[PDB]
Nucleic acid binder design. Structure first.
Ligand code: FES
Ligand SMILES: [K+]
Ligand SMILES: [K+]
Ligand SMILES: [Mg+2]
Ligand SMILES: [Mg+2]
Ligand SMILES: [Mg+2]
Ligand SMILES: [Mg+2]
Ligand SMILES: [Mg+2]
Ligand SMILES: [Mg+2]
Ligand SMILES: [Mg+2]
Ligand SMILES: [Mg+2]
Lengths: 58, 100, 97, 122, 86, 137
RNA sequence: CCCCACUAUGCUUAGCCCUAAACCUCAACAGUUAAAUCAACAAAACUGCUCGCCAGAACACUACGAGCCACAGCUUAAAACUCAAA
């Protein structure tokens, strides 16, 4: 457990943690807000509000 | 000698066209929203086509275009419904601009 | 009365009914090449009709023919005979991404 | 009726295979069968290893025997094939050409079922 | 046991990429239903319980496929409001 | 030539080689991934045992045997004994959906072995013995 | 309840036993979608005709009698006492 002999391995684990930290910081801005691909439930439910299923007669 | 409704219907272009699938028709752009082109082609409902990537600036209000029809009215009955759901618009593919 | 009134008749524009790829063809338990086109290459499992596109009558004939061919010594059970891996792919399924 | 004998024979030389086919066709005739044709499907590798008569087999000769016979001859022939040491596996099925395939008009579409629930408001 | 080996459920590794080969194998076993089959066989599912599960899974497929068909049918209507202000 | 995920069929003429050996000559690593343990045995193409290791033989006990890190340790132990006998390339045959299914294969790679193919042989009866009754939890 | 082991039992043969939330709790046959559409819920509302069955709750899948290869069984099946509800 002497850090002097494990510098390259400690550094790699540190750099990875920082890169995984920034990526975690961006995953929120992009995937949560942009709604890439399929719509989110909230947006998809607004679309169903406009064309409700009609199981009765009018 | 007043023409009856039955005679008008028999000789109307929409009746003479038969099925609308894969039929080439001429449309007219009457409304534009960003890149959404609203096109009337003589049917009950209009169709909404996206502005093509090539010569996009040539598609303006009043421009006459060529369409390939797919359906005059998009409707469908879904599980449990008593009537069909309709989006109140036709289905067509924008081919290009009509020119003389 | 009036010549322009509609007339009663059958839909002239009606499209012919669609047919499965095996409509009108004999399914034999000895034709292992044909039967192999409807089983999984990796597990030998028989594909359902939503994958094979066959109608109800032919999905049944294919199923019965495979089960017969397997136990009579014509067709393997746990995999698709490798000799038939380059036959026309008629089933709707993809295993590689 | 008309039957079809799917016969898988032990991988042997031509003389012993001819003696086995003759011995098998005569067993059918002795039971009142009218043999119509004999087809050779070729020697191949079995789809799986088959154990028959205290022996393991990986290859076999596939043969078909189309014949007519009384209904009581099938049971007696199945018992005969079980004792022939040169037969790996033999099955008798009703000839597939007797079953006439009915004509098919095509696929009739099935519409979504309607009126499965009353139209009252829920 | 009596079949040939290294044919069924076998995937070749490409360029030493063992992770992608394992994911391909797992995807094959899943699509063919072998994974769910193995799990359901760890304990005996009584016949009446299996019939109830199959009925539940079939009703779920019908509902999910109909909801998906309606979503794809209405997705074109998710465009911008053409009559904003009216 | 395009890559084929299907293995080469014995008897046919294939161009694939691994250290001059054909697919039928590569040793086999049998991995049994149970719910509470993982056992790894490396054998030659002629079925000669070359190395064996399990989570139990590597000092793990009770619930610790049924972990991924225990299976990875067993994979490294089996690869070490197999590499001494001249094994480089192996064909992996894994059976069972235990927690050491994928970890055991990582240990084999960490130990210096190269996996050229993966085969699942998890036993699936086609109708078989009745399994034990369900648990009340 | 969880873990392990093992038996009757699950299988075959020959006889019994005759029960189930044996319920899709929706009797068979014929017909209708119009009128008043309909307590509620459930799986829309009805017509003709026939057989079976039901009449507060509990006592009671009980007692007694009778029948049955059934002997701690099955089928048929009450009453008294009790309550103003169920
Ligand atoms: S549609 Fe005719 S047999 Fe399949
Ligand atoms: K009853
Ligand atoms: K029920
Ligand atoms: Mg016992
Ligand atoms: Mg049995
Ligand atoms: Mg029942
Ligand atoms: Mg009755
Ligand atoms: Mg009472
Ligand atoms: Mg009782
Ligand atoms: Mg009693
Ligand atoms: Mg009594």
């Amino acid at each position: 457990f002497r850090d002097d002999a494990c510098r390259k391995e400690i550094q790699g684990f540190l750099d990875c943690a920082a890169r995984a930290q920034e990526a975690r910081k961006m995953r929120s801005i992009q995937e949560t807000l942009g709604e890439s691909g399929s719509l989110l439930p909230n947006k998809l439910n607004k679309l169903l509000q406009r064309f409700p299923n009609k199981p009765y007669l009018s | 000698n007043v023409e009856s409704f039955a005679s008008m219907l028999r000789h109307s272009p929409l009746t003479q066209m038969g099925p609308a699938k894969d039929k080439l028709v001429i449309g007219r752009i009457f409304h534009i929203v960003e890149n959404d082109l609203y096109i009337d082609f003589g049917g009950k409902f209009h169709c909404v086509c996206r502005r093509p990537e090539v010569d996009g600036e040539k598609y303006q209000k009043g421009t006459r275009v060529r369409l390939r029809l797919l359906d005059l009215e998009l409707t469908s009955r879904f599980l449990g419904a008593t009537t069909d759901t309709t989006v109140l618009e036709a289905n067509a593919v924008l081919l290009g601009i009509q020119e003389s | 009365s009036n010549e322009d009134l509609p007339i009663s008749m059958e839909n002239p524009y009606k499209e012919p009914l669609k047919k499965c790829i095996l409509c009108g063809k004999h399914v034999d338990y000895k034709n292992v090449q044909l039967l192999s086109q409807f089983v999984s290459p990796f597990t030998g499992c028989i594909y359902g009709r939503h994958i094979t596109g066959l109608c109800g009558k032919k999905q049944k004939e294919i199923t019965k023919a495979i089960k017969r061919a397997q136990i009579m010594g014509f067709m393997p059970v746990t995999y698709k005979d490798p000799a038939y891996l380059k036959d026309p792919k008629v089933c709707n399924i993809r295993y590689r991404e | 009726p008309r039957y079809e004998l799917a016969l898988i024979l032990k991988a042997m030389q031509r003389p012993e295979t001819a003696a086995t086919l003759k011995r098998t066709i005569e067993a059918l005739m002795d039971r009142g069968a009218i043999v119509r044709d004999l087809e050779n499907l070729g020697e191949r590798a079995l789809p799986y290893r088959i154990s028959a008569h205290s022996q393991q087999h990986n290859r076999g000769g596939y043969f078909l025997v189309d014949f007519y016979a009384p209904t009581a001859a099938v049971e007696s022939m199945v018992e005969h094939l079980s004792r022939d040491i040169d037969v790996i596996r033999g099955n008798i099925v009703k000839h597939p050409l007797t079953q006439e395939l009915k004509e098919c008009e095509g696929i009739v579409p099935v519409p979504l079922a309607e009126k499965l629930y009353s139209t009252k408001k829920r | 046991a009596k079949h040939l080996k290294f044919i069924a459920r076998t995937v070749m590794v490409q360029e030493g990429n063992v992770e992608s080969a394992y994911r391909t194998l797992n995807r094959i076993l899943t699509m063919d239903g072998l994974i769910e089959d193995i799990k359901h066989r760890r304990y005996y599912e009584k016949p009446c319980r299996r019939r109830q599960r199959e009925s539940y899974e079939r009703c779920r497929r019908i509902y999910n496929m109909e909801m998906a068909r309606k979503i794809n049918f209405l997705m074109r209507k998710n465009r911008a409001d053409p009559w904003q202000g009216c | 030539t395009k890559f084929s995920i299907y293995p080469p069929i014995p008897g046919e003429e294939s161009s694939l080689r691994w250290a001059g050996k054909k697919f039928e000559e590569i040793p086999i690593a049998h991995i049994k991934a149970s719910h509470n343990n993982t056992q790894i045995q490396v054998v030659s193409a002629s079925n000669e045992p070359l190395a064996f290791a399990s989570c139990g033989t590597e000092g793990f006990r009770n619930a610790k045997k049924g972990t991924g890190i225990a299976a990875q340790t067993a994979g490294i132990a089996a690869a070490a004994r197999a590499k001494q006998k001249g094994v480089i390339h192996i064909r992996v045959v894994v059976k069972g959906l235990g927690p050491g299914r994928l970890s055991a294969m990582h240990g084999l790679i960490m130990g210096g072995l190269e996996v050229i193919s993966i085969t699942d042989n998890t036993p699936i009866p086609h109708x078989g013995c009745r399994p034990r009754k369900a648990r009340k939890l």
